[PDB]
Protein backbone atom coordinates (compact mmCIF):
# COMPACT_ATOMS: atom_id res chain seq x y z
CA UNK A 1 0.00 0.00 0.00
CA UNK A 2 2.41 2.63 -1.32
CA UNK A 3 4.23 3.63 -4.51
CA UNK A 4 7.86 2.60 -5.03
CA UNK A 5 9.20 5.51 -7.10
CA UNK A 6 12.38 3.91 -8.44
CA UNK A 7 13.27 7.12 -10.32
CA UNK A 8 15.11 8.09 -7.12
CA UNK A 9 15.61 4.51 -5.89
CA UNK A 10 18.17 3.58 -8.54
CA UNK A 11 19.64 6.85 -7.30
CA UNK A 12 23.06 8.33 -8.13
CA UNK A 13 24.54 4.85 -7.90
CA UNK A 14 28.23 4.72 -8.94
CA UNK A 15 27.43 1.44 -10.70
CA UNK A 16 23.92 -0.03 -10.51
CA UNK A 17 23.99 -3.63 -11.78
CA UNK A 18 20.36 -3.57 -12.86
CA UNK A 19 20.52 -6.73 -14.99
CA UNK A 20 16.79 -7.40 -15.18
CA UNK A 21 14.66 -10.03 -16.87
CA UNK A 22 10.99 -10.23 -17.79
CA UNK A 23 10.49 -6.46 -18.08
CA UNK A 24 12.27 -3.44 -19.49
CA UNK A 25 14.04 -1.58 -16.64
CA UNK A 26 12.21 1.69 -17.39
CA UNK A 27 8.62 0.39 -17.73
CA UNK A 28 7.73 -0.39 -14.13
CA UNK A 29 6.08 2.87 -13.00
CA UNK A 30 3.01 2.20 -15.14
CA UNK A 31 2.89 -1.40 -13.92
CA UNK A 32 0.43 -2.10 -11.10
CA UNK A 33 1.68 -5.53 -10.05
CA UNK A 34 1.28 -7.33 -6.72
CA UNK A 35 3.28 -7.32 -3.48
CA UNK A 36 7.07 -7.11 -3.42
CA UNK A 37 9.70 -8.62 -1.13
CA UNK A 38 12.92 -7.04 0.12
CA UNK A 39 16.11 -8.81 1.25
CA UNK A 40 19.81 -8.11 0.92
CA UNK A 41 23.28 -9.28 1.93
CA UNK A 42 26.94 -8.74 0.99
CA UNK A 43 29.03 -10.89 -1.35
CA UNK A 44 32.71 -10.86 -2.25
CA UNK A 45 33.43 -8.87 -5.37
CA UNK A 46 34.40 -11.49 -7.93
CA UNK A 47 31.40 -13.83 -7.71
CA UNK A 48 28.69 -11.17 -8.06
CA UNK A 49 28.18 -12.81 -11.46
CA UNK B 1 13.16 5.11 -28.81
CA UNK B 2 9.55 4.28 -29.73
CA UNK B 3 7.37 1.90 -31.73
CA UNK B 4 7.97 1.41 -35.45
CA UNK B 5 5.51 1.30 -38.33
CA UNK B 6 4.44 -1.97 -40.00
CA UNK B 7 6.75 -3.39 -42.67
CA UNK B 8 9.79 -1.37 -41.62
CA UNK B 9 13.50 -2.12 -41.22
CA UNK B 10 15.88 -0.24 -38.92
CA UNK B 11 19.56 -1.02 -38.36
CA UNK B 12 20.63 1.87 -36.13
CA UNK B 13 22.87 0.84 -33.21
CA UNK B 14 23.04 4.28 -31.58
CA UNK B 15 23.25 4.36 -27.79
CA UNK B 16 19.80 4.64 -26.19
CA UNK B 17 19.26 7.25 -23.46
CA UNK B 18 16.47 6.98 -20.88
CA UNK B 19 17.51 8.87 -17.74
CA UNK B 20 19.32 11.72 -19.50
CA UNK B 21 23.11 12.25 -19.31
CA UNK B 22 24.03 10.61 -22.65
CA UNK B 23 27.05 8.34 -22.46
CA UNK B 24 28.23 9.08 -26.03
CA UNK B 25 29.71 5.62 -26.53
CA UNK B 26 30.59 4.94 -22.89
CA UNK B 27 27.64 2.51 -22.57
CA UNK B 28 27.59 2.98 -18.81
CA UNK B 29 25.28 4.78 -16.39
CA UNK B 30 21.83 5.92 -17.57
CA UNK B 31 22.42 4.34 -20.99
CA UNK B 32 21.92 0.87 -22.47
CA UNK B 33 23.23 -0.72 -25.65
CA UNK B 34 20.30 -1.23 -28.07
CA UNK B 35 21.62 -4.56 -29.38
CA UNK B 36 21.47 -7.78 -27.35
CA UNK B 37 21.91 -11.50 -27.96
CA UNK B 38 21.76 -14.89 -26.26
CA UNK B 39 23.36 -18.32 -26.49
CA UNK B 40 22.09 -21.15 -28.70
CA UNK B 41 23.40 -24.25 -26.94
CA UNK B 42 21.47 -27.44 -27.79
CA UNK B 43 20.60 -28.12 -24.13
CA UNK B 44 17.68 -25.67 -24.20
CA UNK B 45 13.96 -26.30 -23.90
CA UNK B 46 11.22 -25.63 -26.42
CA UNK B 47 10.81 -22.17 -24.87
CA UNK B 48 14.32 -21.17 -25.97
CA UNK B 49 15.00 -23.24 -29.11
Curated annotation (Swiss-Prot), chain A:
Listed result of changing residue 46 to N: In strain: Omicron/BA.2, Omicron/BA.2.12.1, Omicron/BA.2.75, Omicron/BA.4, Omicron/BA.5, Omicron/BQ.1.1, Omicron/XBB.1.5, Omicron/EG.5.1; complete loss of interaction with host integrins
Highest taxon in the source lineage: Viruses
Residue ranges, annotated region (Integrin-binding motif): 44-46
Record's subunit section: Binds to host ACE2. RBD also interacts with the N-linked glycan on 'Asn-90' of ACE2. Cleavage of S generates a polybasic C-terminal sequence on S1 that binds to host Neuropilin-1 (NRP1) and Neuropilin-2 (NRP2) receptors. Interacts with host integrin alpha-5/beta-1 (ITGA5:ITGB1) and with ACE2 in complex with integrin alpha-5/beta-1 (ITGA5:ITGB1). May interact via cytoplasmic c-terminus with M protein. May interact (via N-terminus) with host bilirubin and biliverdin, thereby preventing antibody binding to the SARS-CoV-2 spike NTD via an allosteric mechanism.
Function: Attaches the virion to the cell membrane by interacting with host receptor, initiating the infection. The major receptor is host ACE2. When S2/S2' has been cleaved, binding to the receptor triggers direct fusion at the cell membrane. When S2/S2' has not been cleaved, binding to the receptor results in internalization of the virus by endocytosis using host TFRC and GRM2 and leading to fusion of the virion membrane with the host endosomal membrane. Alternatively, may use NRP1/NRP2 and integrin as entry receptors.
Protein name, entry field: Spike protein S1
Species of provenance: Severe acute respiratory syndrome coronavirus 2
Taxonomic lineage of the native organism: Viruses, Riboviria, Orthornavirae, Pisuviricota, Pisoniviricetes
Shown stretch of the complete protein: 360 to 408 of 1273
Amino acid sequence: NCVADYSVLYNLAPFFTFKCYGVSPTKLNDLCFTNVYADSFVIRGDEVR
Amino acid sequence: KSNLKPFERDISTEIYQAGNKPCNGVAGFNCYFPLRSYSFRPTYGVGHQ
